[PDB]
Amino acid sequence: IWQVVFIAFLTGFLALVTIIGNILVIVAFKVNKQLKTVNNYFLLSLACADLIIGVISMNLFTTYIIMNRWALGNLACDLWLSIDYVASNASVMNLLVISFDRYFSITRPLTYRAKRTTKRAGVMIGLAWVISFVLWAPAILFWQYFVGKRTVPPGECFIQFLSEPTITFGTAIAAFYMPVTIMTILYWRIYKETEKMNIFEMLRIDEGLRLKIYKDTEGYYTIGIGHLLTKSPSLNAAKSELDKAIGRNTNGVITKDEAEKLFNQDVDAAVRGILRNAKLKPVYDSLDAVRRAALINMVFQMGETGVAGFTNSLRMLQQKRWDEAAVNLAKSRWYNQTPNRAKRVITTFRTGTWDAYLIKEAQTLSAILLAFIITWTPYNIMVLVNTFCDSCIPKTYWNLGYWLCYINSTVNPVCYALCNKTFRTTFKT
Ligand SMILES: C[N+]1(C)[C@@H]2C[C@@H](OC(=O)C(O)(c3cccs3)c3cccs3)C[C@H]1[C@@H]1O[C@@H]12
């Protein structure tokens, strides 16, 4: 009992670390405009969940464990639980909101990336806490009054309707296993597709955007972002090819959605072209994200056949000789047709940076995700297990899993700072 008490305070240490880390997140974000963004906004929400959970749950938990008994009675037990599950819930749903956000950033450039603000983010988050609360709290508090009696004996506290290992299983899957799988899906997708954002802003600048058919600087009929319709001067040809392309009668006009989807089609085709080609591929392998994106610009413009006839240049681009590549490109007919765009692309080649386009080059999601899964799944697996054998799990293991579920909330700020040097230097001060 003496050694037990001596070790008990460790938990307190962890709770303190949690509350200060989170409190730091909050303050640092509020006091530094740099840190204000949509993504950082969601990260603020998370740090909040972790704070409310670290100043309340971790502690009263430490208490309950220490005493071996529940002192504060029924209602304290109810509020503690409700705050706890509503909170951690809002934490999972917050993670989801994040993943889906970055996803809609990659896949829906015009519809999503373009209109997204910290206001919209705020709304989404608030709505999330709403959902969480409305799922857990009413159940946890009002289950007794509903059923008419209180299953819970005084002295030991837990959620009334969760007695059964099955309903607990199903609710863990729904509330954990499902959302985790989905976060993994969205994740690996984002991790595969991250560059489409940069290459998007790139082609966006170079080409520009128009919803209704307009004449190119060359005069050719062209629609959307960088989508060429036809070089024939007859408007009918263009409009018709376009219609083929959309699968509707466009009447010369298209929606922003249709547009973003067209772009995506185009880029995927560009890339697929670079990888199908014997020339562009190997070179394209040795290129860093910037330059590579440049290559995808040229290919997105002239086509694979087109960009493959640059062999004089390709040679040096693969050999990491830049100034010579650029020099080799300036002398071609490409540069002659539309010098500005090409000049931007080439500069992008030489420098290896987006500064020509003034462009800002997935982050932290790995960390947060990993922490979450690895501090939760022990417990969820322990539940899945308890479903099938009654006595195989002693209360100890439950408590431990719980603690992990906390050290998530502890570790999340840590992952914040460790991932972004911004949060580092902001905390230091
Ligand atoms: C440590 N917790 C506070 C407790 C145990 C863990 O719980 C979870 O991981 C669960 O999947 C479930 C646990 C038990 C039945 S369903 C969730 C609960 C609430 C939203 S998702 C994590 C959090 C959560 O509040 C519970």
Side-chain angles (χ1 to χ4, degrees), residues 3 7-8 10-13 15-65 67-148 150-248 250-427 429:
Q3 173 188 170
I7 299 301
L10 187 57
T11 66
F13 166 90
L16 199 65
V17 174
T18 308
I19 57 202
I20 59 173
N22 294 314
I23 200 68
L24 275 185
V25 180
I26 308 191
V27 177
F29 181 109
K30 301 289 183 179
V31 77
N32 190 335
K33 284 187 184 180
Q34 290 191 171
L35 298 173
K36 306 173 69 65
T37 313
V38 177
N39 12 264
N40 299 8
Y41 200 95
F42 298 134
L43 297 189
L44 176 154
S45 172
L46 272 178
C48 275
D50 297 334
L51 179 156
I52 176 181
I53 181 184
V55 71
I56 294 171
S57 292
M58 305 188 68
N59 309 353
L60 285 57
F61 187 57
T62 302
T63 303
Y64 174 83
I65 306 178
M67 300 186 63
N68 299 281
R69 158 183 156 269
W70 180 273
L72 265 179
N74 313 132
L75 188 160
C77 167
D78 309 338
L79 281 193
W80 178 62
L81 291 174
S82 56
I83 292 174
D84 208 329
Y85 281 71
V86 165
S88 37
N89 189 66
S91 173
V92 310
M93 298 184 67
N94 230 263
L95 282 190
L96 271 172
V97 160
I98 293 184
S99 287
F100 262 122
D101 169 75
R102 277 199 174 84
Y103 196 73
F104 290 130
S105 301
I106 279 67
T107 57
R108 290 167 181 171
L110 253 49
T111 309
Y112 199 87
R113 265 188 53 76
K115 303 187 169 300
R116 46 176 281 151
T117 70
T118 56
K119 155 199 164 187
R120 306 169 69 114
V123 177
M124 297 170 59
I125 297 184
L127 181 70
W129 284 79
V130 167
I131 296 192
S132 304
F133 169 83
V134 165
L135 288 176
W136 295 107
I140 292 178
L141 306 161
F142 297 178
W143 188 236
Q144 50 173 357
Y145 300 89
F146 188 61
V147 179
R150 197 175 201 266
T151 291
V152 169
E156 286 201 4
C157 159
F158 57 75
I159 304 186
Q160 187 178 332
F161 63 94
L162 284 183
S163 302
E164 270 290 324
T166 56
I167 158 178
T168 295
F169 180 49
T171 297
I173 287 188
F176 178 79
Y177 292 94
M178 176 272 281
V180 163
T181 62
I182 266 178
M183 276 185 299
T184 314
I185 291 181
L186 289 182
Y187 177 84
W188 287 116
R189 292 192 180 192
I190 294 194
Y191 190 108
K192 183 174 181 76
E193 238 98 40
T194 306
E195 193 187 343
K196 264 194 198 179
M197 286 180 296
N198 292 140
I199 88 199
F200 168 85
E201 306 184 33
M202 193 184 172
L203 292 182
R204 171 74 177 93
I205 293 188
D206 287 310
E207 203 70 56
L209 165 157
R210 292 229 247 172
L211 280 172
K212 298 183 281 286
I213 302 178
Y214 75 102
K215 313 186 222 65
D216 203 331
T217 88
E218 299 220 33
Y220 306 146
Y221 289 82
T222 295
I223 205 169
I225 296 182
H227 182 86
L228 175 50
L229 286 172
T230 198
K231 299 184 192 295
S232 68
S234 182
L235 182 56
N236 304 324
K239 309 193 58 186
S240 209
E241 189 76 347
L242 162 51
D243 292 311
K244 174 188 292 68
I246 291 294
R248 195 191 60 177
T250 47
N251 206 329
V253 191
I254 83 161
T255 76
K256 311 178 83 177
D257 283 47
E258 287 172 328
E260 62 177 36
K261 301 176 193 176
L262 231 176
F263 176 92
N264 280 280
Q265 293 193 192
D266 287 335
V267 160
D268 264 17
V271 181
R272 282 153 41 185
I274 314 174
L275 298 182
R276 284 207 305 108
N277 196 284
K279 280 192 180 177
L280 318 163
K281 182 182 173 309
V283 171
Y284 181 91
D285 269 22
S286 53
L287 284 183
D288 73 289
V290 191
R291 282 150 188 167
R292 183 167 50 196
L295 188 37
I296 300 194
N297 180 330
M298 303 183 52
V299 171
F300 171 103
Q301 177 169 11
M302 280 172 302
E304 160 202 323
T305 296
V307 178
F310 285 58
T311 304
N312 284 351
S313 299
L314 295 168
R315 193 201 312 271
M316 300 169 298
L317 270 174
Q318 183 188 16
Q319 297 184 0
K320 294 283 184 297
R321 308 158 68 178
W322 312 118
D323 296 46
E324 309 182 21
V327 162
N328 230 273
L329 302 165
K331 304 178 175 185
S332 53
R333 109 178 188 170
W334 181 57
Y335 180 91
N336 203 134
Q337 305 298 136
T338 51
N340 298 329
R341 186 212 181 104
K343 195 172 167 182
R344 292 185 291 265
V345 181
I346 302 173
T347 304
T348 288
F349 278 101
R350 187 178 54 177
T351 73
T353 65
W354 289 99
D355 306 23
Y357 293 72
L358 294 175
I359 285 195
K360 336 78 179 163
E361 199 188 8
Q363 44 106 171
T364 305
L365 204 67
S366 310
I368 304 308
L369 182 68
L370 262 180
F372 171 72
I373 206 159
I374 192 191
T375 65
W376 288 40
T377 49
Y379 182 107
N380 286 277
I381 287 186
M382 192 168 38
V383 171
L384 155 56
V385 172
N386 178 271
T387 295
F388 292 80
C389 51
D390 324 9
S391 37
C392 40
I393 316 296
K395 293 176 194 180
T396 290
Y397 291 173
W398 294 112
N399 312 326
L400 268 62
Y402 236 70
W403 275 126
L404 296 195
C405 308
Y406 292 156
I407 91 161
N408 164 257
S409 298
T410 306
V411 178
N412 292 304
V414 185
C415 305
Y416 284 5
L418 295 183
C419 289
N420 298 16
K421 288 192 177 182
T422 325
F423 294 88
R424 296 181 184 181
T425 65
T426 310
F427 287 157
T429 72

